[PDB]
Design an enzyme around this catalytic site. Sequence first.
Site: not given
Ligand code: F24
Lengths: 404, 404
Positions: B82, B116, B246
């Site tokens: 990206e 990602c 991821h």
């Molecule tokens: C990639 O697609 C993107 C940045 O380009 C990123 O790395 C992935 C998104 C990650 C989402 C978090 C920021 C939010 C998340 C759902 C955290 C949670 C639910 C942890 C929890 O304790 O539940």
Amino acid sequence: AKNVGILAMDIYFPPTCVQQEALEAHDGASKGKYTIGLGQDCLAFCTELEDVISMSFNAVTSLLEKYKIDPKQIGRLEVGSETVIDKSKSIKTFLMQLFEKCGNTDVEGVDSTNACYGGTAALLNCVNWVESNSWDGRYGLVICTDSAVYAEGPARPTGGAAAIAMLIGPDAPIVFESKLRGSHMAHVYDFYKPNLASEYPVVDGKLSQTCYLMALDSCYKHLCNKFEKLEGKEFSINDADYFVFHSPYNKLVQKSFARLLYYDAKVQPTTLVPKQVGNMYTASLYAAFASLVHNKHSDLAGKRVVMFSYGSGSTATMFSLRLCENQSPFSLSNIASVMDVGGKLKARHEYAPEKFVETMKLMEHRYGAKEFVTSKEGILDLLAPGTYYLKEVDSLYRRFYGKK
Amino acid sequence: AKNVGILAMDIYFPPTCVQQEALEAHDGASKGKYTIGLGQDCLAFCTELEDVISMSFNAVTSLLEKYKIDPKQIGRLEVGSETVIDKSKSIKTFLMQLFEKCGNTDVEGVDSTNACYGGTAALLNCVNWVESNSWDGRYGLVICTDSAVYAEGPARPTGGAAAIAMLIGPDAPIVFESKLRGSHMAHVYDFYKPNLASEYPVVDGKLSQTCYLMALDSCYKHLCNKFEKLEGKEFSINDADYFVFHSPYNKLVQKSFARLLYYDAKVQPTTLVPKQVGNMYTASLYAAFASLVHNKHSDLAGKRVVMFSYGSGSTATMFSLRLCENQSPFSLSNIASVMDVGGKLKARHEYAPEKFVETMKLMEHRYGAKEFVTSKEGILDLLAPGTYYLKEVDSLYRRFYGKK
Ligand SMILES: *C(=O)[C@H](CO)[C@H](O)CCCC[C@@H](C)C/C(C)=C/C(C)=C/C(=O)O
Ligand SMILES: *C(=O)[C@H](CO)[C@H](O)CCCC[C@@H](C)C/C(C)=C/C(C)=C/C(=O)O
């Protein structure tokens, strides 16, 4: 999974357009600089209400409605484009909107990029997905979508816009000859968009000239090698019924086929929509193909159609297709009927060159803009009923669409 | 074409980095806001000399050199990312530079985007290409590459950079279980980059929370359905030896696995490189996988490794792999040896937080810049011999690279 290829097809382009001849007059240009020099007759463009996303909704909706495809029956959806809306969020995610209010979220695929090739790249990916061990029995769906904004300069007569949708699966009327292909890929600085803030490309004309011909030659020679293995002879112009090309402007089509050496027989029926709509980038090759189905659907069964995809940078593939009449809804004859290319050209709405130029200025301003509502009066009236349109972009760059 | 999967693998990340604890002190942050709150220990970043392109040359060169792969033997090359350098010219075209001075230009594939996930999308495409009628007998090659610049704000501790290269073909040590998968794709405005001029995302934290868990749940449930068909039972945590995620930050890894409900047995060995290098975006899942091979290569034969790929917007896929020891060069044991993850962590070069912040300011300035030469003294000395680096960007945005 046998005889995999294109089952069904549809095309949308904006109904708003400007005449090339009128544009020559409006510009400094001497008679036939666009109509003869480029070989182009009409230019379709997006107004403030339409973009690559809305055009994609039109194309996908129409295909599924008209060939009567159930949305749950799509297993892979991929998009080819070089029109960047977001640097993270793919055009594909937008398209999932259509699949949620029937619960089909298990759908592989994303966006494929390289210049006016990404549609081809995506199509090859779907064909491969149907033939893979991972295939779940469902249709693939490929979208090519692009739109150009040039408000100024020599690029301005060379724009255009459309979206194409293609249904992929086995037992198709349009069958890929798996091994009859040649690709050519290189690292060149020929035609590129390195300025994130701007739509205007950097073009190296002389290098673009050399690199395009090198690709076309190399793709051709590699397809010939594979033909020699497949059928026991060298491939010539005589070994296909039709040649379809990436068609940003019709003069490139003429030169390209000439380079392979007939045009009136093999290439001329592929020129209808490209010449009337303009440069469609990733969708251009496929609009040229659509024109061929429209013009010749009753002659096409039994024939070989060779297809050449280019994208600057550069990435090219020449590949071959075997067409046959099949059973409706997935027949050469039903595909022509549904696309109604003739109906769509009649339903168009012409703009004086000045109003075209004003609309292009507006599009410059909205490009990268946020927090605005689109202006509808006089424009919405020009769209066919059911057309998706952009209502607004909020202060967080979210885009909201309407239908009608 | 049987037992298709990952044959060979390599990873490059920039040797320059900053300690999370030192950064907490430098920022206003209370003890353990990064090391505990994020669960991260070190952050690798690109200096002016390195980018997603150079990192890609490092990874691809190293794979081909070390596993002794002939460049003519690559038939499809695809890139997931990206990080946008050009809106037309794909990272893939740059990579063709390596294939020209041996004449291998007939190479399918382009760039795949969604947040990602693009690396995953590209990997699936290659696996499918090896299994398709179009397959020409040659290796596929997948690259995941990403780099972050946050000079300011709460995003800054959450960056990172790497490139991963994966060789794809039949009879692999890392075999895809074709049907053991589940995808989930939707139209959401959770985490996106709608400002073409800027690297800074628009994040909707609360929606990001909901959308990520929905995907993970749905992907999980769909894999379970396919498991029921495949083996005759419901899938549980007990039905795989390891779960790889991821891994932008380690706390997400902890929550995600917990959500599936062991961590010390099934997930902990996947955390080495993500925790030391930071968010690697498209390459993050695969760096987590690389850490698993590094840590456990001698235990991995016979085991099932479940893999979960996410990308905001959103696109997700959970999929499954069957590992076995095979024959060198394509063995679990040779892959660990070649990647030399331990050797790469020892060879690193630490920056005081201030020098990290200065370097981030510099990267802000160079982003979208043209006509500049990079400054090398004191930095070039820190790169391993053979490393590709950026020498300059000319007045037409062309990038020129050196090696050493
Ligand atoms: C990639 O697609 C993107 C940045 O380009 C990123 O790395 C992935 C998104 C990650 C989402 C978090 C920021 C939010 C998340 C759902 C955290 C949670 C639910 C942890 C929890 O304790 O539940
Ligand atoms: C798509 O990849 C791209 C714009 O996004 C474009 O449509 C394709 C590049 C077309 C290249 C021409 C501008 C140059 C060309 C080789 C013309 C020639 C050789 C015709 C001739 O007479 O030879």
